[PDB]
Amino acid sequence: PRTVKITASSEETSGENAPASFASDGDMNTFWHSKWSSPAHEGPHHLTLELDNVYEINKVKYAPRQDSKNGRITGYKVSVSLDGENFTEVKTGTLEDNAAIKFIEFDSVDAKYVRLDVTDSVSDQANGRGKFATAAEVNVHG
Ligand SMILES: CC(=O)N[C@@H]1[C@@H](O)[C@H](O[C@@H]2O[C@H](CO)[C@H](O)[C@H](O)[C@H]2O)[C@@H](CO)O[C@@H]1O
Ligand SMILES: [Ca+2]
């Protein structure tokens, strides 16, 4: 399944270069960051992959940002869509608070769009729970 594009609730291109599309390749040294520079978007955070076609998919891969825990996703909702407007929830859960590649698995389902809603996220800042969302890579498989 080829990712045509990634959209997000927001992205940072002013304080550093971290647009949503950085999460659509497997370079572990680049990432999407939610917008943190003023005016910041501090949630809710999400990310939508637009696949080039309808695919039967059953897995999402999440590579955390590798150089910092800011925005690391510890709670998520996965939804799928055929039209990019109406979404169906297929999976909810948590992910461990570390920089390891994560996999989210669910029953096979047709999708052209796959949306990752960030329900929980961590930070190295004391009051930073949920403020940030980052991803070195989000990808889908079938
Ligand atoms: C303990 C502490 O406050 N550390 C901070 C880092 O969080 C901070 O890292 C940046 O934080 C912003 C969001 O505020 C983005 O996530 C950015 O990508 C991070 O580099 C740095 C700021 O350089 O400063 C302290 O170390
Ligand atoms: Ca990347």
Structural overview:
This protein is mainly β. It has one domain: Galactose-binding domain-like (Jelly Rolls, Sandwich), CATH 2.60.120.260. Helices cover 0% and strands 50% of the residues. The strands form two sheets. Strands 1, 3, 4, 5, 6 and 8 form a six-stranded antiparallel sheet that branches. The relative contact order is 0.30. It binds a molecule of 2 linked components (NDG-GAL) and calcium ion. This is O-GlcNAcase NagJ. Binds carbohydrates. Capable of hydrolyzing the glycosidic link of O-GlcNAcylated proteins. Can bind and deglycosylate O-glycosylated peptides from mammals. Can use p-nitrophenyl-beta-GlcNAc and 4-methylumbelliferone-GlcNAc as substrates (in vitro). Belongs to the glycosyl hydrolase 84 family.
What is the third-level CATH name, the topology? Answer: Jelly Rolls
Overall number of structural domains: 1
Please tell me how large the radius of gyration is: 14 Å
CATH superfamily: Galactose-binding domain-like
Distinct small-molecule ligands in the complex: a molecule of 2 linked components (NDG-GAL), calcium ion
Approximate helicity band:
under 10%
Cα-to-Cα separation, first versus last residue: 8 Å
Give me the secondary-structure category. Answer: mainly beta
The CATH architecture comes to Sandwich
**In terms of quaternary structure, what is this?**
monomer
Q: State which percent range the strand residues make up.
A: over 45%
Helical run tally: 0
Major sheet size, sense and barrel closure: 6 strands, antiparallel
* Gross morphology: globular
Count of distinct strands = 8
